[PDB]
């Protein structure tokens, strides 16, 4: 019961970044993207019209994560600076300004993801993940246990649990409320560079630098499926699921996104077209578009 | 469609400022300083530490990190500056390990490395006194002979430490990137202009390959 060939193709090109793109996030409206690049700018794209909606200058040009608040009001970014910045988009003054600069991490920030518009969970290279209250700027909860840099985060659909990936080659699942590790299974041979949740919250897929992905479920305590081919020996930079999981889009350092069949573990397609390592990859909320950013400075919308 | 066309004006307005800002975020040369611990990193001029400087009206922006894996972010820099004091031995082989890890890193194979052999004074005075023997740590040094006021005693040893680093360089790279060794003292003002000359070579070399003259 395969899915044949998913001959997806470019439908837009969101040109405008002057440097390497590192992260983007789809707004809940399924229209607005926020993209972060080393140029030092956050650009709010209107995918439908290829229109730039906001441009947000940043204090630190070394961004490595970005987020779009589910309410659509706030966007967050993080990077080598140990401060996570929350920006307010619906300012009555018209311009976007910072609301809180979340200091407190000992190392670089690798992933940030809002939570119900008032709590933001971030992971840093100092081997810690943290949950914050944006208003006060304090760490409501601190997560420890990694033996290395934490590189990626993914919020569950319910937002009660979130998973982290670190360079210790283990995937750690955490509780926002209970504040201690629930699962820490391992199995990768190298750094876990990216993490994403399956739409049901019971699974998440790991992207590792050993050129192999793995599909984990909390009940299994082990990898269920592993995605790799002998002709691909480059690390995975980003991962995102499809609206029903079938279409596991994954970014690779070889300048193309391998479109893996989540259930079948077969390379059912390739969204080639990028001139450099494809870094970030995200599917819309409605499942109607997959936006792919790369170090080529181009964001492409595929359908 | 009147309101939607007004959004196009805002979209093109943003692109105008991005390229306006993108013409000054370029034309400055990013540099990464990966000197080893207990060295003269801060002498030759948030988690990230920056030090801007400019010679001949070219703006340099050097970056340091106190808090391996983030190195992938720096595959655009003009060069990497690896600073090691040439006076210690118990971690000099450790310093050579550090250089190899940078020279052979996947994302750095297109990046030249400027190597600063700082604290030559300490090495010069140290071997001149001879209170400790190099051969105890580098037995192969006993076979070395020089290839070139000026002291001929320690200069025999001075080029050995450079020889050790350059040997790690020519063993790989294959012309995609080059290692530019240097000797310096932590009083010298020449540290700034050495990098300027060295980045001109790196930039000139980059043109030679992307314009098909090599």
């Amino acid at each position, epitope marked *: 019961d395969p899915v044949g060939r998913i001959q997806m193709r470019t439908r837009r090109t969101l040109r405008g970044h002057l440097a390497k793109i590192y992260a983007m996030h789809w707004g809940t*409206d399924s*229209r*607005l993207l926020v993209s972060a690049s080393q140029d030092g700018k956050l650009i709010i794209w*209107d995918s439908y019209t290829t*229109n730039k*909606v*906001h441009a947000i200058p940043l204090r630190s040009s070394w961004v490595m994560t970005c987020a779009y608040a589910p309410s*659509g009001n706030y966007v967050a970014c993080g990077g080598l600076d140990n401060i996570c910045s929350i920006y307010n988009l619906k300012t*009555r*003054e*018209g*311009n976007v300004r910072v609301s809180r600069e979340l200091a407190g991490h000992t190392g670089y920030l690798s992933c940030c993801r809002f939570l119900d518009d008032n709590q933001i969970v971030t992971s840093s290279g100092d081997t810690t993940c943290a949950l914050w209250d944006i208003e006060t700027g304090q760490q409501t909860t601190t997560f420890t246990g990694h033996t290395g840099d934490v590189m990626s985060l993914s919020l569950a659909p319910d937002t009660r649990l979130f998973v982290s990936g670190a360079c210790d080659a283990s995937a750690k699942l955490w509780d926002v409320r209970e504040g201690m590790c629930r699962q820490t299974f391992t199995g990768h041979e190298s750094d876990i560079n990216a993490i994403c949740f399956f739409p049901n919250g019971n699974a998440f897929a790991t992207g590792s630098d050993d050129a192999t992905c793995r599909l984990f479920d909390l009940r299994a305590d082990q990898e269920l499926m592993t995605y790799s081919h002998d002709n691909i020996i480059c690390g995975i930079t980003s991962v995102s699921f499809s609206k029903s999981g079938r279409l596991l889009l994954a970014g690779y350092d070889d300048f193309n996104c391998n479109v893996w069949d989540a259930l079948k573990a077969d390379r059912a397609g390739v969204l080639a077209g990028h001139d450099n390592r494809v870094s970030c990859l995200g599917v819309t909320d409605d499942g109607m578009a997959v936006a792919t950013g790369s170090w080529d400075s181009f964001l492409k919308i595929w359908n | *469609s*009147a*309101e*939607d066309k*007004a*959004a196009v*004006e*805002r979209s093109k*307005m943003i692109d105008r400022n991005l390229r306006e800002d993108g013409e000054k975020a370029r034309r400055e040369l990013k540099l990464l300083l990966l000197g080893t611990g207990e060295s003269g990193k801060s002498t030759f001029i948030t988690g990230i530490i920056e030090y801007p400087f400019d010679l001949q009206k070219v703006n340099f922006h050097m970056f340091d990190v106190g808090g391996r894996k983030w190195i992938q972010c720096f595959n655009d820099v003009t060069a990497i500056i690896f600073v090691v004091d040439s006076s210690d031995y118990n971690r000099l082989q450790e310093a050579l390990n550090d250089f190899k890890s940078i020279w052979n890193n996947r994302w750095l194979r297109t990046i030249s490395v400027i190597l600063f052999l700082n604290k030559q004074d300490l090495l010069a005075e140290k071997v001149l006194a001879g209170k400790s023997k190099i051969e105890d740590y580098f037995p192969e040094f006993a076979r070395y002979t020089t290839p070139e006021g000026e002291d001929p005693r320690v200069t025999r040893a001075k080029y050995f430490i450079r020889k050790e680093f350059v040997d790690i360089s020519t063993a790989s790279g294959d012309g995609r990137h080059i290692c530019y060794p240097h000797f310096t003292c932590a009083v010298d003002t020449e540290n700034a202009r050495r990098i300027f000359n060295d980045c001109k070579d790196i930039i000139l070399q980059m043109n030679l390959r992307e314009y098909n003259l090599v």
Partner: single-chain antibody
Amino acid sequence: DVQLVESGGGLVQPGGSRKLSCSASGFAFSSFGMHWVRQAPEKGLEWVAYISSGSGTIYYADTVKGRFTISRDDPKNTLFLQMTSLRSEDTAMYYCVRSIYYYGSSPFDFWGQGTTLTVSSDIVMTQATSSVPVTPGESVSISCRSSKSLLHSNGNTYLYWFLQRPGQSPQLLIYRMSNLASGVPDRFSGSGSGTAFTLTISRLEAEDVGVYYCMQHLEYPLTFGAGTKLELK
């Protein structure tokens, strides 16, 4: 907070000329486009001119085209409108209005207090409910009609609703036919389809009294209906 104050009005002798000035304060006026709007003393509203965020596009009302000259000075957060020659029908109140256009925008969010310039010596919006008595606790609903369907294929519908309370500048109630603007209580909501539309209110409050106004902003010129004056009793 946001605030726009304008001046330059006053009585004008026959054959004169005047410049209205709108001084923005407390917001990124450079990022907003500017509109001028007119209200006759007892004969409804009327659009005047338009200058965009970046003076790449300009528009004027037919009754003033050429005579007027809309100008802005972004670095000083000031807007102008140079008026050339004089005509008796120019007698009316003028208002300064801000609008910023991006996907989720709410054009016409803020209005100045206006400056009087009384003188002495295109799609059509319409609403049959010129005036109606109302009492507290009712759920009165107003209606306005269009000469062309406003549902452009985008799904956008550029009909607007405002409230010019007594002695007060208009405040944006519903933008793009259904959307609730900033500072507007939950009481208000626009609904319908196609060409005629209902601005519904529940639990009418004493502050919900004045003269409502409906305009269609599919394309320039912009046109007003006579509005709806509410007599509270």
